[PDB]
Design a protein around this nucleic acid. Structure first.
Lengths: 71, 142, 169, 294, 159
RNA sequence: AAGCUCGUAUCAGUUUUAUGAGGUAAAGCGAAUGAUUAGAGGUUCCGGGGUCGAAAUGACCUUGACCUAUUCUCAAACUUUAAAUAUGUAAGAAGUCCUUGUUACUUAAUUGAACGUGGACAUUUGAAUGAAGAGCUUUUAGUGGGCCAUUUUUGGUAAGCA
RNA sequence: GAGAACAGAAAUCUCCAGUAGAACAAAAGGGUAAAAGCCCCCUUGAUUUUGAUUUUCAGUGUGAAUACAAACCAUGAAAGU
RNA sequence: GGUUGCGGCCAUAUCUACCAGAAAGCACCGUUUCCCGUCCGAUCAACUGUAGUUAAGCUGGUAAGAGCCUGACCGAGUAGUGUAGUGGGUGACCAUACGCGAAACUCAGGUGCUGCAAUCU
RNA sequence: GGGCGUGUGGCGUAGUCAGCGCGCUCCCUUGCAUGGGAGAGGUCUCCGGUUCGAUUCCGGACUCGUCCGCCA
């Protein structure tokens, strides 16, 4: 917050510092991401994370994401 | 048409103009304002291609000057007799109408044909009169 | 299973690239004509390349296409020139295979001092019966996956027929 | 891995028409055929559609509506046993006989048959069905050869010749008939007459039966089974022609069954679609199978 | 300089559409136009002959002449302070029948049918259309539909 | 300005209903074109740098390309989609239906095309609102430097700027 | 992409994938896949006679274009163009 | 209901990978004297329907398939926008009043229908 | 500040969508005079695009040499 507040002086106009309700750089909420990552339906990438969907071919959905189907 | 108009400012160096009904090739162009308010005048110094004389004319820049069509064409010698070259075109056409050059070009061409080189002749057409300007030798296809 | 899955030689195409038009081209065309029993077709150059010295459209190569038992006979002569040994790289993913040979003396034409010496490229195109589906004008279709020729089938056929062995490389 | 198409490709792809995808219709040719001079307002344009499959020749007379094409009359080559032709149901003379049959059938069902009798005594000359004065014009029809190659000697033109001698007014020139000399631009009538009466197959029958008999047993086996020799096919073509000019009335077959009787067996044999609930049960069983730790 | 050609500013207007390029279907050639028909004008970019000008795109007119492959249509064009009569020769790929006219003819024939059947009784036919009248009295019940109280929601960031 | 032919209509800077047409605002880029940030997994007969290697179409790291699944941000001269406001036509009597006359056009054909004869349907005659009269013609004046405001918008740092 | 002597990054041949990512004289934008593209065959409709219409517009001219009529031709099996 | 010929709308029809196909019809298939066309009877032309085969084409089915189509009070009455005020704000811009109203997203469902003629256990 | 021209082996340059001559270095031949043949030598100022291909066609950039920048 202090780093963004120091950075705000270099900008014209008005800026706000808002603490987001999301987990990191994703778009789910904190308890939504927690209840998603307790199951195996997330899998990490280089910095981001890939998610499971109920669509698609079951063979690809099982070679990826094995722990969720390990039920 | 044989000749087409152009503007003086549109003209530039190493281009052909008609001065006193002669095909001429420009060596010098200079523009100077007539009066402070007025338009500049173009002073043109050119050389006749056939005769080599120096001809100059000054005109308004907006004025239109006459410009010839000059075609340079490439031929092979067959014979030099009586001051008339005999040439041979691609696809086998032959002309004998060209008169031989009369200067040091003609002397060098005569000596080269006497000692037996295969000579490549450039002849130019402009405003219905015909002449030879330069000759080379064929480096390949001997 | 296997009623009409039997592989056969669709065609043998013989290609000679002399690279420049004229007397050679005619001599190579004569060699191809006497070998095939058919008049050959010369092929124009698509683009001008200086390094090769070619320009556009001077009929720089000559080739012929032979089909049937005569093509099989010339392929027998080419394989006995090659001593029935071919590289694994010679075969392709589609199942077609080719090899290149030097001189027709090994083919046994014998030598004329005028005609010179020209090597050849042999290419064999393999198909199953039912290949007319792609070629015919009406109701043109694509061949099914199981019925397609492949590299493993063509090397198995080349091991079984002509009693030849393929090189590992 | 190699033969893979992206979702972007499959989304931006535009399919052609269904008949073009099947490869059965040339729409460039179809537009030039079926369109009408708009000052002839609802006047139908009629196509003699001639198609050659293996073992059949199909001739139809077809006009075009927006809801689909409409057939006046059809004549197939497999009903030629009714007129006495049993073998060679796709030869050039069979195409001639099918064209003659569809011509006589259309003029009978239009009532234009007592006039425009066509070429009764055939000789192989090139002429068209000209209009008789103070009466109706002859029936005008145009070919639809489809994707078939135009070629001097092709049997679509035999179907044309049969329909033209049957009394239809079909526009054509003579330079695609067999016997057309290219250098001397004229038609040879006796070779065309030989082809109408089957000369090209009977001459082959003689010139192969005299030397190679195993071929004469392999093909033309039905000719020996029905004792048809080389010279009699001319008069059975003549008798077939006069049987067509007697009655083209087209009695259909008795079908041996009913539509629902065929439909019961074919509905039993056809495979059905899988519903949503059993698809869900199938995928739940698959999840319990492979992803259920075996 | 400026540029006002015959097909200036016609880029998106004479594009074909998404995924229906190619040749045109045969219904446009099988449709029949008579003199006095009312037609809409929409140009087909695939056909370059008999094209309308960009002004008449989306215009509706009346057929006055039928030729071999085209149709003569009459449009009213506002020029200055009055309308002028414009005659256009357009190939039939660039026109189709107006559906409002056939809807009105269906109303005419159903209206004549109503008048003909009700003429046998004289029951005050009332054949004119009427617009949306104000809705009349009704009684809404709460059996299984007790009202649910709603309130404004407080403010949140939602990012 | 002079009127003329008529007497409530072959009207309307309006709405409704029905039916068209459009490519702006918005939106989109794990959709085409183009721009663009970051890692991840792969490809080396198929890269470049180092280190180990006798060397090796050798090895190990690193860095570049290409592919695969993602990720961040954009477009006056990009786009699958796509408004609002404006915009074309129709809402009958010059209409609809029935019957049959003409023709040198057209059809295989009284088939069709166009214009017709005779007959039937009238004040809810075909949505709303208003009509202040509706339609038509001749002749001629002055004018042909404009400017301002809200909204959209171009050039410009901007302007009581263009 | 996968192959074939010389032959390799680029010479010619063969197969597969390929909605156009090519080409269509030129600027750009549209349009085009048994084609409007590439190759081949035949030709001169790039002809005659005057009208009508669209754009710019005063509904003048000029330029360009559209659909017909009356001939005479080209091409194709033909519809047609 | 299957199949063929000609179609209409032109992916609910396309694409990828498998599986199945009784009968009939298509198809592959056999042949080069004749018409015809090729470097090559491979395509095209002609002949036989004979020597054979459903292997392929074709049709149908399968896939928490890709795509495409339909619907939703799913997002969202959101973005945008017509009209109004001597409304707010230094401004940038923003609220309200009377109206119109998206797209992406999410979820659910579907995966050719049909005209004319012929023919089929 | 704006406009025009300019770069090719050492030099002169020419040019179709890199050539000679004179230089350089060798070899050979024959004076009075010589001449010939070989080579080494050029990213066509540079970078892109176009085009089968660009010295050539176009765009951008660099260098150098010019010509204007006036009335109040």
């Amino acid at each position: 917050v202090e780093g963004l507040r120091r950075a705000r002086y270099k900008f014209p106009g008005q800026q706000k510092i808002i603490l987001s309700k999301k987990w990191g750089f994703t778009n789910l909420d904190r308890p939504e991401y927690l209840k998603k990552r307790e199951a195996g339906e997330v899998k990490d990438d280089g910095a981001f994370v890939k998610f499971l969907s109920k669509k698609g071919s079951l063979e690809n959905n099982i070679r990826e994401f094995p722990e969720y189907f390990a039920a | 048409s044989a000749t087409y108009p152009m503007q003086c400012s549109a003209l530039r160096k190493n281009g052909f103009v008609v001065i006193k009904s002669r095909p001429c090739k420009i060596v010098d162009m200079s523009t100077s304002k007539t009066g402070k308010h007025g338009h500049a005048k173009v002073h043109l110094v050119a050389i006749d291609i056939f005769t080599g004389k120096k001809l100059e004319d000054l005109s308004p820049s907006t004025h239109n000057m006459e410009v010839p069509v000059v075609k340079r064409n490439e031929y092979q010698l067959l014979d030099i007799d009586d001051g008339f070259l005999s040439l041979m075109n691609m696809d086998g056409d032959t002309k004998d109408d060209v008169k031989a050059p009369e200067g040091e070009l003609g002397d060098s061409l005569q000596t080269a044909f006497d000692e037996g080189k295969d000579l490549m002749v450039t002849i130019i057409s402009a405003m219905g009169e015909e002449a030879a300007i330069s000759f080379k030798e064929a480096a390949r296809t001997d | 299973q296997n009623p009409m899955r039997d592989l056969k030689i669709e065609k043998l195409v013989l290609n000679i690239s002399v690279g420049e038009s004229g007397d050679r081209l005619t001599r190579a065309s004569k060699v191809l004509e006497q070998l095939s029993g058919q008049t050959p077709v010369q092929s124009k150059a698509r683009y001008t390349v200086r390094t090769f010295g070619i320009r556009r459209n001077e009929k720089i190569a000559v080739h012929v296409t032979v089909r049937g038992p005569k093509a099989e006979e010339i392929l027998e002569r080419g394989l006995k020139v090659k001593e029935y040994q071919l590289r694994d790289r010679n075969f392709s993913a589609t199942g077609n295979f080719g090899f290149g040979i030097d001189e027709h003396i090994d083919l046994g034409i014998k030598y004329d001092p005028s005609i010179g010496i020209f090597g050849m490229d042999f290419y064999v195109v393999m198909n199953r019966p039912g290949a007319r589906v792609t070629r015919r004008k009406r109701c043109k279709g694509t061949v099914g996956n199981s019925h397609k020729t492949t590299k493993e089938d063509t090397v198995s056929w080349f091991k079984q027929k002509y009693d030849a062995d393929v090189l590992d490389k | 891995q190699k033969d893979a198409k992206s979702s972007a490709y499959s989304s931006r792809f535009q399919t052609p028409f269904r008949r073009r995808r099947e490869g059965k219709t040339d729409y460039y040719q179809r537009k030039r055929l079926v369109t009408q001079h708009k000052a002839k307002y609802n006047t139908p344009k009629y196509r003699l559609v001639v198609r050659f499959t293996n073992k059949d020749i199909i001739c139809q007379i077809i006009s075009s509506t927006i809801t689909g094409d409409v057939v006046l009359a059809a004549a197939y080559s497999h009903e030629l046993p009714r007129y006495g032709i049993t073998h060679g149901l796709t030869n050039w003379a069979a195409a001639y006989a099918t064209g003659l049959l569809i011509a006589r059938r259309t003029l009978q069902k239009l009532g234009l048959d007592e006039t425009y009798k066509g070429v009764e005594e055939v000789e192989g000359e090139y002429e068209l069905t000209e209009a008789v004065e103070d009466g109706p014009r002859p029936f005008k029809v145009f070919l639809d050869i489809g994707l078939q190659r135009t070629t001097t000697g092709a049997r679509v033109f035999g179907a044309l010749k049969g329909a033209s001698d049957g009394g239809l007014y079909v526009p054509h020139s003579e330079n695609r008939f067999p016997g057309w000399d290219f250098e001397t631009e004229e038609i040879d009538p006796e070779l065309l007459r030989s082809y109408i009466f089957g000369g090209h197959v009977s001459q082959y029958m003689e010139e192969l039966a005299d030397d190679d008999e195993e071929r004469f047993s392999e093909l033309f086996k039905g000719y020996l089974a029905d004792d048809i020799d080389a010279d009699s096919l001319e008069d059975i073509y003549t008798s077939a022609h006069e049987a067509i000019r007697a009655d083209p009335a087209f009695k259909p077959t008795e079908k041996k069954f009913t539509k629902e009787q065929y439909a019961a067996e074919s509905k039993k044999y056809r495979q059905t679609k899988l519903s949503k609930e059993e698809r869900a049960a199938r995928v739940a069983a698959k999840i319990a199978a492979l992803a259920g730790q075996q | 300089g400026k540029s006002h050609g015959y097909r200036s500013r016609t880029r998106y207007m004479f594009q074909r559409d998404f995924r229906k390029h190619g040749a045109v279907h045969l219904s446009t050639y099988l449709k029949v136009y008579k003199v006095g028909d009312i037609v809409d004008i929409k140009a087909n970019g695939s056909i370059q002959k008999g094209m309308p000008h960009k002004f008449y795109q989306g215009k509706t007119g009346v057929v006055y002449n039928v030729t071999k492959s085209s149709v003569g249509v009459i449009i009213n064009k506002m020029v200055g302070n009055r309308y002028l009569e414009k005659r256009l020769n357009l190939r039939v790929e660039h026109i189709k029948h107006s559906k409002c006219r056939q809807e009105f003819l269906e109303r005419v024939k159903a209206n004549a049918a109503k008048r003909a059947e009700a003429k046998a009784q004289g029951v005050a036919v009332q054949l004119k259309r009427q617009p949306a009248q104000p809705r009349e009295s009704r009684i809404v019940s709460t059996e299984g539909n007790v009202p649910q109280t709603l309130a404004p929601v407080p403010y949140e960031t939602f990012i």
